[PDB]
Amino acid sequence: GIDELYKKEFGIVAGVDEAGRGCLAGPVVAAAVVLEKEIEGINDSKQLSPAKRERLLDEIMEKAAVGIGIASPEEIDLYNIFNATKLAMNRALENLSVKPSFVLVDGKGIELSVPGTCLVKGDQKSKLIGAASIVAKVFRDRLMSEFHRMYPQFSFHKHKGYATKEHLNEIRKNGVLPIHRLSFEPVLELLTDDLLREFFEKGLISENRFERILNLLGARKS
DNA sequence: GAATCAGGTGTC
Ligand SMILES: [Ca+2]
Ligand SMILES: [Ca+2]
Ligand SMILES: [Ca+2]
Ligand SMILES: [Ca+2]
Ligand SMILES: [Ca+2]
């Protein structure tokens, strides 16, 4: 009832959610969704099965206005994952062709460029948020698969860059990449300033990012 | 789908 209630009062309402807070590699992805038609079975995203999420997606993209926003591994390393997530969400809102007057954002502590409110477990209280969580996850899983193709030695298509045993194995065996979040503890502990300087000289990371991670390596660790 | 192992970080 959330959505409809908020629509009476505010007009165009979008639901916003992100995917990729907790992984070790790749961008964080956010989606903003405005939806008027009914879509049955929207219940969350991490609550669903991959087969299902693909089914609801096809219907969500038929019936809903969607905006997708991304913040890169560099932005995560420089701004932290909270601020990177906020940025991806604000970018999702900009990418929505329909301009929302109010937003419902999954989680808490988040104020976007559009006035709205935060719902803990929003993904299971709101259909709009539930839809956004599906779009976010699916779209990001698509990007991650694309990386596996770019980095054949890494099973990105399976673990989606999260800290699974297999992913950690691949990092030790194959080495840290620029798409890893170099500020994240497990990646940071396998890094050397040697490889970091190599990334920089090859131009694979920015100076600002080089500088930040070099400082973190030094602080590693008391 | 739900339990229950694993393992990332931010707000307060
Ligand atoms: Ca989510
Ligand atoms: Ca969320
Ligand atoms: Ca949740
Ligand atoms: Ca610093
Ligand atoms: Ca395991």
Numbering used by the authors: 2 to 223
What does the article say, verbatim?
Ribonucleases H are the only known enzymes that degrade the RNA strand of RNA/DNA hybrids in a sequence-nonspecific manner, and therefore are essential for DNA integrity. Type 1 enzymes hydrolyze all types of RNA/DNA hybrids but require at least four ribonucleotides embedded in a dsDNA sequence to cleave (Ohtani et al., 1999), while most type 2 enzymes can hydrolyze all types of hybrids including DNA-RNA1-DNA/DNA (Eder and Walder, 1991; Eder et al., 1993; Jeong et al., 2004; Ohtani et al., 1999, 2008). Tm-RNase H2 contains two domains—the N-terminal catalytic core adopts the RNase H fold. The nucleic acid substrate is bound in a groove on the surface of the protein which is formed between the catalytic and the C-terminal domains.
The third structure reported here is that of wild-type ΔC protein in complex with a single ribonucleotide substrate in the presence of Ca2+ to inhibit cleavage, solved at 2.1 Å resolution (structure WT-1R-Ca). The complex structure of wild-type protein solved in the presence of Ca2+ ions, which inhibit cleavage (structure WT-1R-Ca), contains three metal ions bound at the active site—two of them very similar in position to those observed in RNase H1 and other RISF enzymes. According to the RNase H1 nomenclature, these two ions are referred to as A and B and the third ion as C. Therefore, our WT-1R-Ca structure of RNase H2 with Ca2+ ions is likely a good model of the architecture of the catalytically competent active site with Mg2+ ions bound. The geometry of metal ion B coordination is quite irregular, as also observed in RNase H1 (Nowotny et al., 2005, 2007; Nowotny and Yang, 2006). It involves side chains of D18, E19, and D107 as well as two oxygens of the scissile phosphate—the 3′ leaving group and nonbridging pro-Sp. The coordination of metal ion A is octahedral and quite regular, and the coordination distances are between 2.4 and 2.6 Å—longer than ideal distances for coordination of Mg2+ or Ca2+. Metal ion A is coordinated by the side chain of D18, backbone carbonyl of E19, pro-Sp nonbridging oxygen of the scissile phosphate, and pro-Rp nonbridging oxygen of the phosphate group at position +2. The coordination of metal ion A by the phosphate group at position +2 is possible because of the deformation of the nucleic acid backbone introduced by the interaction with tyrosine 163. In type 2 enzyme E19 is in similar position, even though it comes from a different part of the RNase H fold. It also coordinates Ca2+ ion B in wild-type Tm-RNase H2 structure.
